[PDB]
Amino acid sequence: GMNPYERGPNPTDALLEARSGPFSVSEENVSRLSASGFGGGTIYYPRENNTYGAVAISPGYTGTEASIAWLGERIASHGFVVITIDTITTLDQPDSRAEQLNAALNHMINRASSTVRSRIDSSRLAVMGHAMGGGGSLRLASQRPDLKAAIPLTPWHLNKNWSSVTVPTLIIGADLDTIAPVATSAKPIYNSLPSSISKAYLELDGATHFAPNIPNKIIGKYSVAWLKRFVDNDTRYTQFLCPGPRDGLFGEVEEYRSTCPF
């Protein structure tokens, strides 16, 4: 098609809500010893002979790669090369996690096997992270306006003012989070982002701080729609983001805000 970055079948709610997307995925192990500037991890990549955008995902404080593994694989299965990382130590702070997200992106582009490197369009990169890892994704986005998307999940950073970020950013909050409360963290972060960038706020209903650490159909669906729209420029996914998920009785979320139209 006209957009050279479109991958996969035309989307539906059911296809985005499924446990796995349409792309067969393989894994490349990144040992802690092979990793420069992060703690190792796993690269999930589509076996099909396309090039895809690449995504690095960081866990949060005391969290391991296993706390975010499901989301990396799910996203990769919709047509992305995704690394889920361990950090250098489990106690690393958000700004350290930002440096490690950068190191993880660089590893995929420079240090992985030719099998992985040949499937990456190194010009189309995104970052994600849970909690302090979401704070890391915000810091790195602020330093790297070349990134195509950022998805901070139940994020925390010391700094809530990310008005300098121009990367399309989807903030995911959890209404029952007591560890990084949306009242003091996710919502101040989201409202700091400029009106003039592509951004959205998605607050999960009945959700704790740890909602991102188990398979979650809503997180999977809208993370994939966000990356599709902004890493792939794929306007087939605009309809999922704008006006976006409904709230209330038959809805998907507690609250959704956006700078739609995209």
Numbering used by the authors: 40 to 301
What wording appears in the published article?
Cutinase is an esterase that belongs to the α/β-hydrolase superfamily and primarily hydrolyzes cutin from plants. Unlike lipases, cutinases lack the active site-covering lid structure such that the substrate-binding cleft is exposed and directly accessible from bulk solution. In addition, the substrate-binding site is more expansive in cutinases compared to esterases, benefiting the binding of bulkier macromolecules. In this work, we investigate the PBAT hydrolysis potency of cutinases and PET-degrading enzymes, and find that cutinases outcompete other reported enzymes.
We further constructed the inactive variant S170A to obtain a complex structure of BTa but failed to obtain any dataset that contains additional electron density that can be modeled with the ligand. We thus turned to a BTa-like compound MHET, which is composed of TPA and ethylene glycol linked via an ester bond. As a result, the structure of the S170A variant was determined in apo- and MHET-bound forms to 2.21 and 1.82 Å resolutions, respectively. In the MHET-bound complex, the omit map clearly indicates the location of MHET in the active site. Notably, the ethylene glycol portion of the bound MHET was located outwards and away from the catalytic center, opposing the direction of those in other MHET complexes (see below). Nevertheless, the hydroxyl group of S170 is estimated at 2.9 Å from the carbonyl carbon of MHET, which is within range for nucleophilic attack. Therefore, the complex structure should present the substrate-binding mode of TfCut-DM. The residues that ineract with MHET, Y100, M171, W195, and I218, are conserved in IsPETase and LCC-ICCG, while I218 has an alternative residue in LCC-ICCG. Superimposing the MHET-bound complex of IsPETase and TfCut-DM indicates that the ligand binding modes are similar. In both complexes, the TPA residue of MHET is bound to the TPA-interacting Trp (W195 in TfCut-DM) that adopts B-type conformation via a T-stacking force.
